[PDB]
Amino acid sequence: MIVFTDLDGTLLDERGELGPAREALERLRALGVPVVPVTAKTRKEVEALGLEPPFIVENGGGLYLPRDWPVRAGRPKGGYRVVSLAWPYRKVRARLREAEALAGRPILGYGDLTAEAVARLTGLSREAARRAKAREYDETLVLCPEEVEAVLEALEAVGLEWTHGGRFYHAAKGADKGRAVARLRALWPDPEEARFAVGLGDSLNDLPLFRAVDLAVYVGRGDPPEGVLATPAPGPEGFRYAVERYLLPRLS
Amino acid sequence: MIVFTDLDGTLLDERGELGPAREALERLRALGVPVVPVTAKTRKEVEALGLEPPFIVENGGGLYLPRDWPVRAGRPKGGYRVVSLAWPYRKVRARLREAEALAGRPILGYGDLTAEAVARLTGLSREAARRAKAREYDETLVLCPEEVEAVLEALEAVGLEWTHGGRFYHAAKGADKGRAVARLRALWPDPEEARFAVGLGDSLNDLPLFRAVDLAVYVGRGDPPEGVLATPAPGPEGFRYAVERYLLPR
Ligand SMILES: O=C(O)[C@@H](CO)O[C@H]1O[C@H](CO)[C@@H](O)[C@H](O)[C@@H]1O
Ligand SMILES: [Mg+2]
């Protein structure tokens, strides 16, 4: 069994700390059950949380492995090997300019904004904001609700894909949480262990995750996606409940 | 006679310079008629156009005089004396953050954006956008259509004023082209010379300028505001025209 989990609003509390899901992760770690973050966050944000690879960043844009992963794949980055699944940020940013032309209205994302500005929009510290700005694949859009339909049509018109992560829309090309999970499972050095995948998530960007795994659990505040298991409380209390009530039984 | 003039689409053609107004200006120089730019542009922007003080920047927020101006006014600042008429940019930005809270929604302006973002927004080059970002009095806002009214209400609730500059909204406190014009005329060395003032402008954004001068001329695309003269062709072709029709014969 492998557990793939979203970070923001699933394994992380409202501020951005792992605290409340610590004992839940403890149990899995003690049972030797691999837990893999699959998140909209950047590699720099993930690293600051102290998390080790493997993990998947930027909505499936990038898969980061340990340098000594027994299956050779991706390119060296000192301590990592990186598998790129999506277009690079620079290319998305260029295609967004074309979209803005079509929409006839500015389309701003993090790349347009100062760290100070990002920090005010997101409630992050200035330093955390600099890390959220260090994007390699996916752009976070800052859109007015009234213009969303127009902007999203302009994205698709120029060949970009969009998704929504809880508070912000994102644009990318080839970044899908499900595709990245599928790749990692195929690169897993123990086929048996990767036979059964569990996926936990809370927003739109997690739908492709729920299709890529064998047991899907929704911990968001809405009602669950079609035929997906749900929990009594959202968030980390949801994560804890799922581990104790859905997973452990299957591991005994 | 003193000539007060907007730069956008008045002296400056669509390209960014002034073709047809060039001889019109040299002529004015010949008869010793002072010309004073009155603009939404920053001092850095105005200097890059190679313009000399006196001039009025940021919609009337600041009056820049030659350091050796015969009338002592303003605070010395290198080769300039500066008369500040408006709240400083940093104070405007602080108030904008209160307005965001009242409005319950983000309010973005140039101060939040990179120069590259500003350039793409305005059609300027990166280096010109850095100059546009060096604001001392007023903020340029990047608002969306449906939230504009909530935001404007919020701005006025926290003590700011707003204007529409043609492309974007602007927020400031105390910046008014008319007030800066009235102040410069009061600080003019030769009072007889400041007695007759002409104003040439684009858009209704120059209506405060039109009110502070004795002869107002509109060279925009729309219909001239009530009580303002108009020209056939807009831009520096209207400046040129207005100068040989209204001015040169004096
Ligand atoms: O879409 C959002 O709601 C979140 C979570 O999905 O992602 C963005 O927003 C987060 C901040 O809330 C950033 O930390 C991420 O890097 C990303 O920019
Ligand atoms: Mg999430």
Angle (deg, nearest 10), helices A89-103 and A148-157: 120
**Does the beta carbon of A103 sit less than 6 angstroms from any atom of ligand 1?**
no
Indicate which technique resolved this structure. Answer: X-ray
Phi, psi of B186 (to 5 degrees): -65, -25
Single out the residue of A62, A39, A59 nearest to residue A51, CA to CA: A39
Helical ranges in chain A per DSSP H = 22-30, 43-48, 89-103, 115-122, 126-133, 148-157, 177-186, 207-212, 235-242, 248-251
Q: How far apart are CA B107 and CA B151, in angstroms?
A: 7
CB atoms within 10 A of CB A92: 27
CA angle A24, A29, A33 (to 5 degrees): 105
Ligand 1 atom nearest residue A140's Cα: 18
- Show the domains of chain B with their CATH numbers: 1-86+174-250 (3.40.50.1000), 87-173 (3.30.980.20)
**Does the beta carbon of A84 sit less than 6 angstroms from any atom of ligand 1?**
no
Resolution in A: 1.9
Q: What is chain B's length?
A: 250
Which residues are within 5 Å of ligand 2 (an ion), measured at CB? A 6, 8-9, 166, 202-203
CB atoms within 10 A of CB A79: 11
Residues 6+ apart with CB under 8 A from A192: none
Strands (E), B103-153: 108-109, 139-142
Residues 6+ apart with CB under 8 A from B105: B147, B150, B151
Would you say B138 is a known binding-site residue? Answer: no
Ligand 1 atom nearest residue A58's Cα: 16
**Does the beta carbon of A16 sit less than 6 angstroms from any atom of ligand 1?**
no
